Amino acid sequence: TSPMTPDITGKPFVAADASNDYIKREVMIPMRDGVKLHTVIVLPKGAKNAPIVLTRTPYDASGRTERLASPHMKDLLSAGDDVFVEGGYIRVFQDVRGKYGSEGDYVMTRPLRGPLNPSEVDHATDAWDTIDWLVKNVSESNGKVGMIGSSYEGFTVVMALTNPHPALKVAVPESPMIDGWMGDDWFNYGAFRQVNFDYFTGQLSKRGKGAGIARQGHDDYSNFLQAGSAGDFAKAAGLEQLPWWHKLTEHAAYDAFWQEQALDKVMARTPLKVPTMWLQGLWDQEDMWGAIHSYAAMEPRDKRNTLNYLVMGPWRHSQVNYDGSALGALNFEGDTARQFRHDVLRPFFDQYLVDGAPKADTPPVFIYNTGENHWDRLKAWPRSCDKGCAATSKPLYLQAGGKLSFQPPVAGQAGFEEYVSDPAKPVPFVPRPVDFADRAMWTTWLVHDQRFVDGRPDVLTFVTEPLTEPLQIAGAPDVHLQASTSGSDSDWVVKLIDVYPEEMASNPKMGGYELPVSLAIFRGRYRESFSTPKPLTSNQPLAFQFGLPTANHTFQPGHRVMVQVQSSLFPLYDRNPQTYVPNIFFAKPGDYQKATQRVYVSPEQPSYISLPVR
């Protein structure tokens, strides 16, 4: 070999694959319009009549099938695919239209053929053509296909369910994106989520891998506050080059653009034919709305209770595919994620995909009790609600003096609790400094101790005396807030908290820990209507009604129930200027004003939470 022989030959370096216990095949599958989608198929060596598990993703199919470069399939594929490797399944990941190895144009959460999409293709037809090709060209398969995926990967499963290929025998949409305005990714009750600015450049900058937005500093509390409004931050970052950004600001309210994209409404008029398991985390910080709302839209038509299932674990977004033994300071009884994957998911998929496999005794509802630390196998959910459930909700009244109880307010006390909300000094949603990039912070923010803001003058705290008997809730709490603002707009944040016993000697850090079981924010301008915003009348007590995330939680003896109320949750949510403007995205510096907020706790105007007690 000559010394001047180029050490980089130019020809592709073929990695070793002799010792592999799998085969990886990449193929460009033509859709009905000629556009080919990059599809990666991983088969166990010696696979015969094996089912296929398919996932359609905008997060790199080649990368999703290489958690680690390894000759062992169990290590090659992600942690969440462990049960599929153990079951001898063929795993397939496909790049959606317009991303990574696939051809075509990319449209964020490409809408269904209809009012928003006049083309001949969408995610439903793309999944159909994909499945058709797989059962006709993968000789190692038995022609049976199951679909699974979390977040955007769950959204593609839902799209396939709108009109599924006959070969699709089972589906598991995990934390799917269903309604990005009401309560999933983009907004929550109209309040815009700034955490997704990095997602926009990360997914829309290039066909393939993108990047986050360069910051002025480390603390996002400071980065966003200094920039001003959400529109100011975006403009300075160059986001006006992205059509998606223009779509968000042109549709700030819940108009036809968002209504026509709500997939739970679509599931309501979609016939039940494919056994589907709606899954999400109880602390799903990205898609809290999706799974539970989609499950409820189809459950009334699940006549025999064997086609529509619900799964809600003690998980943060997508934790179902990793280790569910803990979340932040909370410890659970074993790896709850692995428990779900092995005890419930595997037998459910085997029943519909593996030849000769027995029927599984899949629980209609598989939900974790975050207070008692154990799974619950039920026939229905919720167990308690205002009407139609086994148990009836009980009003939990906010009381004067920062108290909280099931007894209606008595006369002869202060009619309300007051606090000033200052947009220039907003309440932080997590301890400063805030780093949206820090995955540890973002995935655990919903279970973080709230004492870092308890005692702030712009946060109201209501608490019960220590419980002597366990209080079990099992449903979706509903806020019935009676509040006024001296401004003409305002956000209202309510947190339902489990305060641990003041002392916890066996785990000292948990002593007095304020765990948010369920919390939400509501953009006040949408009080009467989500599609048609209106200014709030200054200094007038008004009724605000909105649901808090689902909870299957027992407040144990020694614990207290607590409710915190505030008017900002920054920088996760852009600040409500507190003066009515046409579009908060483009609020001007002078529009931001302090406002005197009042939460009423009188017999005539009682604030309370309809708690799903059982």
Judged by CB under 8 A, which stretch of 35-43, 246-254, 291-299, 601-609 contacts a copy of itself?
246-254
Structure tokens at 62: 């080649």
Interface region with a copy of itself, contact rule CB under 8 A, candidates 182-190, 449-457, 515-523, 541-549: 449-457
Nearer to a copy of itself, 250 or 355 (CB): 250
Beta carbon nearer to Ca ion, 366 or 555: 366
Residue type, 43: L
Among candidate residues 102, 94, 89, the one with its CA nearest the CA of residue 153: 94
Binding window for a copy of itself (CB under 8 A); candidates: 67-75, 187-195, 299-307, 536-544 = 67-75
Contact with a copy of itself (CB under 8 A): which of 103, 132, 140, 335? 335
Given candidates 395, 433, 535, 606, which one binds a copy of itself under the rule CB under 8 A?
433
Please count the CA atoms within 13 angstroms of the CA of 546 that sit on its side-chain side: 28
Out of 23, 36, 63, 75, point to the residue binding a copy of itself (CB under 8 A). Answer: 75
Rounded CA-CA distance 160/125 in Å is: 8
Tokens describing residue 512: 């007095």
- In this complex, which beta carbon is closest to Ca ion, that of residue 371 or of residue 475? 475
Q: Which of 156, 197, 200, 203 is nearest to 175 (CA)?
A: 156
Q: Is 3 in the site for a copy of itself (CB under 8 A)?
A: yes
Near a copy of itself in 96-115, by CB under 8 A: 98, 105-108, 111
Nearest alpha-carbon partner for 221 in 422, 450, 429, 439: 429
Out of 63, 143, 212, 395, name the contact with a copy of itself by CB under 8 A: 212
**440 is a contact residue toward a copy of itself (CB under 8 A):** no
Query: How is residue 534 written in tokens?
Result: 């209106």
Taking CB within 5 to 8 Å according to partner kind, which of Ca ion, a copy of itself, none is near residue 126? none
**28: partner contacted, choices Ca ion, a copy of itself, none (Cβ within 5-8 A by kind):** none
x/- letters, 485..514, toward a copy of itself (CB under 8 A):
----------------xxxxxx-xx-xx--
Residue carrying the six token digits 């309604």: 179
Stretch that binds a copy of itself, among 181-189, 332-340, 469-477, 599-607 (CB under 8 A): 332-340
Q: Which is nearer to a copy of itself, 155 or 295 (CB)?
A: 155
Which helix (H) or strand (E) segment is 266 a member of?
helix 263-268
Nearest approach in angstroms of CB 305 to Ca ion is 4
Q: Closest distance between a copy of itself and the C-beta of residue 335, in Å?
A: 7
Comparison of 91 and 169: residue with beta carbon closer to Ca ion: 169
- For Cα atoms 412, 417, 421, give the angle at the middle one, nearest 5 degrees: 165
Decide if 292 contacts 312 (C-beta within 8 A).
Answer: yes
Is position 314 an interface residue for a copy of itself (rule: CB under 8 A)? no
| Element containing residue 365 per DSSP (H, E) | strand 365-369
- Helix (H) or strand (E) holding 143, with range, is strand 141-150
DSSP string, 299-364: GGG-TTSSSEEEEEES--TTGGGS--SEETTEE-SS-HHHHHIIIIIHHHHHHHHSTTPPPP---S
Tell me the H-state helices in 569-608. Answer: none
Smallest separation (angstroms) from Ca ion to the CB of 308: 4
Partner touching 302 among a copy of itself, Ca ion, none, CB below 5 to 8 Å by kind = Ca ion
Whole-number Å distance between alpha carbons of 347 and 357: 8
Q: Using CB under 5 A as the criterion, which residues of the chain lie in contact with Ca ion when the complex forms?
A: 302, 305, 308, 364
Site for a copy of itself in 137-196 (CB under 8 A): none
